[PDB]
Each structure stands twice: as structure tokens, then as C-alpha cells.
């Protein structure tokens, strides 16, 4: 869909629809964390495939705390019952223990351990053929394209003896090795393998192409860090087609129509007022809803994300002239 | 080469002074300035320091609440809501004919810095701990904010009697 | 906080006076709005201040009401008590904005600038990577590197 519409609001609902019906539900609350994260480590178990421990270790934690109900009763089909358990670590007999096995460890032992878990955690999710499984990842477009983690300069694999005779430009000039395609990420491989490998009508993908990219209009010098709306935003600048760059079926989600936008912003300000996060006692200085609705529709295009930012900007609307006129009308009646 | 053992007129010039005034014209000796930061006066230092709230903080913050909402760690909130209830009560209407003192005229020139220095010093003395024009504390009846932390909705099961 | 170099403080009124220039900078009060909004804290003083500026900005162009001779002076007195109120309203909000933010950085673990106090995490003034030997006000020789007040992990 368009950038900043109800892109992920559909997803968060889709999981709430799933985990209510109790079906096992995987959920990547931020696919940015994997493909655009703090660091990327080669998987020790798996050759040529990389791992991101910052999100993986968390993903193991959450998949435990989220589906801990089912995953307990969810027995492990195919995985060695001899994974190295620390002093006082029970053997995993249900997958729920296997995810406990990884994230519950003192780093840096976790990093080598989570690489194995993320390799075998999917081995159970794939082997299953009856238990309905739903896979959701907010930001699938980041999984199909490259990742800003770039392959290390090969001299990091040569154990350089010295510098002058090193014949080595890692110290002098930073040169750009190609980006790591997210399909090389072992966990994304876990997903991507299930996409191509057929005969798996058990696993389902309800995914969302996120578009939070740094807006580039053709020229952009330095941002003004005193107020920069997109510092935490992602930086892609890449045009994405879900058609040619994915297998899932496009479900184009669009900006609200004036119908749904109405019931939203009615909720957005009135319920907000009820919880005290609104004007409250000084309501009468604020305009009414119809003006507040009509004006935001102008500035926001009914884009749900832009609505929020514009709703927060009811504060500084300088050229409202309803209440100042209406109060003057009331004093006439009085 | 062979640096002469005694230098004829290199050191035999006039002595050079080292600047000894920490500021303009090399005259301002060290003394407690107006810019001194009284950390004791209130939860913020007085005077306050230049504080920028960039959009990187907010978006990082918005992720932070994604933790204490689900992790249930509502305590870190419970410092805030009390920190706000005390420091946000309606500032009382000042009585007729009262105003903050302005720099008395004719004491100095208009251009002399003694104008702003006095205003800063007056605004030092009126630290928020001394802000009596605004009410706060236990005795102030709080009509807007709920009184007890359990009245905040995260304890909705206990609110249910 | 990406700004950490030494700073210069200005009294509340001397900043409040700038009005829509920096004090009531439209997007700034939108920043501290969301921050207040998201924290579950009611934005009562901000919207209390917001109407103060919005009326002043809207009416900064006109003349003052005609000063007809009033021996009572009640109008001149009312012209003052209503003013010092407005200043006192922004005084509270100006301090309020600095109250939460420094405390907010206590929750995001962002080291504020020099000579800055976070209520619990940095009781006295924090100073790291300054241009001088000692803590500028407490005359304590700095430790190298810049001392840290939060716990290392995220």
C-alpha cells in the first residue's frame, strides 16, 4: 500500500485474530530489527548463512512467552535430544523448552546457541503437517531485498601479520563489499525455505510490506537534527513491487475513506478526551469536531499515520475562528 | 648543527607573559557566575540547561512504552504520574497589583549588562522549590488526576471491587 | 541526546518572551505534546500555554487598548495581574518541560549535556567530555572516560 497507511494495523489485528482462536502465531514485531539491526553474525552451525542475535534471541524469547500455552503441548518431532545443556538445563522434549533453551543462557554462550536453535526451531515448524501455523512478519519487503550488513573485507579472514607489508587497504579506505541478501539470513531462510518448498498447506503467511523510508524528493542535503522526523526511519530509497519481489498475494490496503476515517477520528479525539489526554477543562478554546475533522482531512489526505501526527497538531492551529465567533454569538443571546 | 652550549640571544630576550584572565581582555578571574547550576533546587537544576527534544528520542521512547505496557512494569510510570500531579496544578491567580520586580531604571545604563544579570539572579532565587504562586503537595485537592496509583487503569481488576 | 557540549542557561521569562520564535515554535510544542501524550501524562499545561501564545500571536499586530485616564487604575492593575499570571502559567510549563525530559532520558538512558541533573540517575550535575580539568561547579577533577550513570546493557 501507500507509505504510512494502515499497513501494520492490519497485521497486529491479524495476530489478535489468530491468537484469539489460539492457533500458533509467529510474529516479527519489527522485521527492521533483522535486516537492519545492531549487528550481524555468521551462523556457527550453518555455513554461509548469517544470524542477527539482537532480534533472534528476542524472537526466541517472545515465541516462548507468546505461544507458551500451545508450545508446551507441542511435542518436538525431529531434533537431537542431545543439545549441549548447561549445568542445570533440562532436555527439550517440547519445542517450548527448545526456545527456552536458547534465550535462557548467559551470553556470549547464547549467541552460538541461538544460531543452533533458529536452525532447529523451524525444523519442527516445517515438519508439522496437521497443526495450523500462521507466520506473520511486519516488513517482508526487507526480507526479499539486500541488507545493509555488508560482507567483511576478505583481509579479516587472513589474520594479517603487519600493516606496511600487509598489502591491505582495510585501514586506509573503507570500500563497499556487496550487501548481504536477507535470504542468506538463516532465520529468513527458515521462512524463505518454507515459501518455495511445496506440500506445506499448514504454514500461512500474512505479511506486510512496510514503507517507512527516508523520503527523498530529488535533493536532500543534511537533515536538521534539531528537528528531524526520520532519524529513526529506515533508509532504503528502493522502489518495491510485491508482485515481482514476493510470492504472497497482494492485498492493497489504502488510506481511510471518509466513512472509516470519520469513526476513527471520532474515537481518536473523543475517547482521548474521556481518558483526560485531551483538552479537558479548556475544551471550549479548541474547535468542535466537524472543523477538527474537516481540517485534518485536508492536511492528512485521510492517511491514518498522518492523521495521528496531524491530530497531535490540533495544538498549534493558529487560524481557527469558530469558538471566538461562537462565544461572541452566545454573549449576544445572553 | 651542534646546538651551541649557551644560546646568545634566544633566551636573552624580554620575558613573555601568560594570560591570567579566564575570559575577555584576559581579566575575568574565576568567580561563581550567574550560570552556576543549583542541582539541589528541585528535580531539575536551576537554572535549567538547554534541552533539545529531537524526534530520535520520541520514536525511541515510543518503543520503550512497548515494553512497560506488556511487561507490566508499570512502576516506572508511577513515578511520572505522581511527578506530574504535583507539578501541574492550576497556578493560582496572582492578587491585584502584584508583579515580578523588573530592573530598576536609572541604576545603570540601558546597554550595561547589569540589566540581564539582575533578572537572572532574581530568577535564581525563585527556584521551583520556592514557587509558592503554584499550589502542590498533599493538601491540594487534585480534581483532575486520580489520587491513588491503582486508580490508574492498569489495575482495573482491583478497581473492580 | 546528541548534544553534549557545555551550555548556557537563560532565565524562564527571557525564553518565554520569544514567543512563537522559539518558545511557542509550532513544531516544538508539538514535540513536547506527543512526548506528554505518549507518557500517559495529561498535556494540561501545554494546552494551557498553547492558547496563551495562540491568542498573543494572533493579536500581536493590534494596538494596546486606548489608555484613557483612569484614576482608579484598576484597568492598569488588571493589565498587570493578568499578565504576571500568564508568565506564571508559562513559568510552570517551562519548568515542566525540563522536568519530564531529563527524567525521560532516565528511561531511555540518554546522557544529557554538561551541568545537567536527572532526578535519580544523576543526582548532581553530570559532566563528561568537557573542555576543562574539573566539574565546572563542583571542582571535582573529571574521571576519564566520561563517567556513566546507567547500566551497560540496553
Amino acid at each position: 500500500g501507500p507509505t504510512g497507511c494502515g499497513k501494520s494495523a492490519l497485521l497486529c489485528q491479524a495476530v489478535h485474530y489468530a491468537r484469539s482462536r489460539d492457533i500458533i502465531t509467529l510474529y516479527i514485531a519489527n522485521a527492521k530489527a533483522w535486516t537492519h539491526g545492531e549487528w550481524c553474525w555468521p551462523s556457527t552451525i550453518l555455513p554461509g548463512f548469517f544470524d542477527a542475535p539482537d532480534a533472534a534471541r528476542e524472537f526466541l524469547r517472545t515465541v516462548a512467552e507468546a505461544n507458551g500455552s500451545l508450545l508446551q503441548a507441542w511435542e518436538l518431532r525431529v531434533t537431537p535430544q542431545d543439545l549441549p545443556l548447561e549445568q542445570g538445563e533440562k532436555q527439550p522434549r517440547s519445542l517450548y523448552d527448545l526456545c527456552e533453551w536458547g534465550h535462557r543462557a548467559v551470553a556470549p554462550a547464547s549467541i552460538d546457541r541461538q544460531s543452533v536453535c533458529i536452525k532447529f526451531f523451524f525444523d519442527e515448524i516445517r515438519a508439522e503437517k496437521t497443526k495450523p501455523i500462521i507466520i506473520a512478519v511486519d516488513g517482508w519487503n526487507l526480507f526479499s531485498h539486500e541488507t545493509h550488513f555488508r560482507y567483511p573485507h576478505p583481509d579479516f579472514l587472513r589474520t594479517l601479520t603487519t600493516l606496511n607489508d600487509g598489502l591491505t587497504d582495510v585501514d586506509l579506505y573503507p570500500q563497499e563489499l556487496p550487501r548481504i541478501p536477507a535470504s542468506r539470513l538463516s532465520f529468513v531462510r527458515g521462512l524463505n525455505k518454507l515459501i518455495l518448498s511445496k506440500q506445506d498447506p499448514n504454514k500461512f503467511f500474512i505479511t506486510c510490506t512496510t514503507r517507512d523510508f527516508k523520503p527523498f524528493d530529488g535533493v536532500s542535503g543534511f537533515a536538521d537534527v534539531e528537528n528531524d522526523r526520520f532519524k529513526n526511519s529506515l533508509d532504503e530509497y528502493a522502489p518495491y513491487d510485491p508482485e515481482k519481489d514476493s510470492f504472497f498475494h497482494p492485498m492493497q490496503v489504502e488510506n481511510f475513506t471518509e466513512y472509516e476515517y470519520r469513526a476513527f477520528l471520532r474515537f481518536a479525539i473523543n475517547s482521548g478526551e474521556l481518558a483526560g489526554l485531551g483538552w479537558g477543562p479548556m475544551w471550549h478554546y479548541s474547535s468542535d469536531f466537524e472543523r477538527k475533522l474537516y481540517k485534518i482531512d485536508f492536511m492528512s489526505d485521510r492517511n491514518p499515520q498522518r492523521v495521528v501526527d496531524h491530530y497531535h497538531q490540533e495544538l498549534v492551529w493558529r487560524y481557527e475562528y469558530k469558538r471566538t465567533r461562537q462565544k461572541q454569538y452566545l454573549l449576544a443571546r445572553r | 648543527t651542534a646546538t651551541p652550549e649557551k644560546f646568545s640571544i634566544l633566551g636573552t630576550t624580554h620575558p613573555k607573559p601568560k594570560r591570567n584572565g579566564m575570559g575577555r581582555n584576559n581579566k575575568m578571574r574565576s568567580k561563581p557566575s550567574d550560570n552556576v547550576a543549583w542541582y539541589d533546587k528541585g528535580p531539575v537544576e536551576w537554572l535549567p540547561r538547554p534541552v533539545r527534544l529531537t524526534y530520535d528520542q520520541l520514536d525511541q521512547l515510543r518503543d520503550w512504552m512497548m515494553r512497560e505496557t506488556i511487561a507490566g512494569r508499570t512502576e516506572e510510570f508511577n513515578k511520572i504520574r505522581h511527578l506530574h500531579r504535583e507539578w501541574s496544578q492550576h497556578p493560582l491567580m496572582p492578587v491585584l497589583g502584584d508583579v515580578e520586580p523588573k530592573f530598576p531604571l536609572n541604576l545603570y545604563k540601558q546597554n550595561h549588562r547589569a540589566k540581564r544579570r539582575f533578572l537572572v539572579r532574581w530568577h535564581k532565587a525563585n527556584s521551583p522549590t520556592y514557587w509558592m504562586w503554584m499550589p502542590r503537595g498533599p493538601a491540594v485537592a487534585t480534581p483532575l488526576h486520580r489520587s491513588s496509583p491503582s486508580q490508574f487503569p492498569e489495575h482495573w481488576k482491583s478497581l473492580a471491587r | 541526546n546528541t548534544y553534549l557540549t557545555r551550555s548556557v542557561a537563560t532565565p524562564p521569562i527571557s525564553v518565554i518572551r520569544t514567543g512563537p520564535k522559539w518558545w511557542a515554535e509550532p513544531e516544538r510544542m508539538v514535540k513536547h505534546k506527543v512526548m506528554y501524550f505518549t507518557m500517559g501524562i495529561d498535556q494540561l499545561p501545554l494546552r494551557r500555554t498553547a492558547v496563551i501564545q495562540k491568542d498573543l500571536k494572533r493579536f500581536h499586530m493590534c494596538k494596546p487598548p486606548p489608555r484613557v485616564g483612569d484614576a482608579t487604575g484598576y484597568k492598569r492593575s488588571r493589565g498587570a495581574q493578568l499578565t504576571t499570571w500568564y508568565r506564571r502559567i508559562q513559568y510552570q510549563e517551562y519548568h515542566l518541560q525540563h522536568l519530564f525530559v531529563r527524567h525521560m532520558w532516565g528511561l531511555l538512558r540518554m546522557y544529557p549535556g554538561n551541568t545537567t541533573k536527572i532526578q535519580g540517575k544523576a543526582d548532581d550535575g553530570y559532566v563528561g567530555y568537557d573542555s576543562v580539568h574539573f566539574h565546572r561547579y563542583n571542582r571535582s577533577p573529571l574521571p576519564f572516560p566520561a563517567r556513566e550513570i546507567y547500566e551497560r546493557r540496553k
Binding site: - | 496572582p94 502584584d98 520586580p101 539572579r121 535564581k124 532565587a125 525563585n126 504562586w133 | 494551557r48 492558547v51
Partner: peptide, 23 residues
């Protein structure tokens, strides 16, 4: 012109401590 009209009670005369320096 008076904006933000409100009816909270009055304050106490001299609610602020005087300055650090004066005549």
C-alpha cells in the same frame, strides 16, 4: 485582550522570595 479566562482562587501577596541582589 484577556484570553484563557479562568476562575481559580487568588494567590497570596508576595508569593515569591525576593531576588539575590537589590538596592
Amino acid at each position: 485582550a484577556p484570553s484563557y479566562r479562568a476562575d481559580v482562587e487568588r494567590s497570596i501577596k508576595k508569593p515569591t522570595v525576593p531576588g539575590l541582589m537589590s538596592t
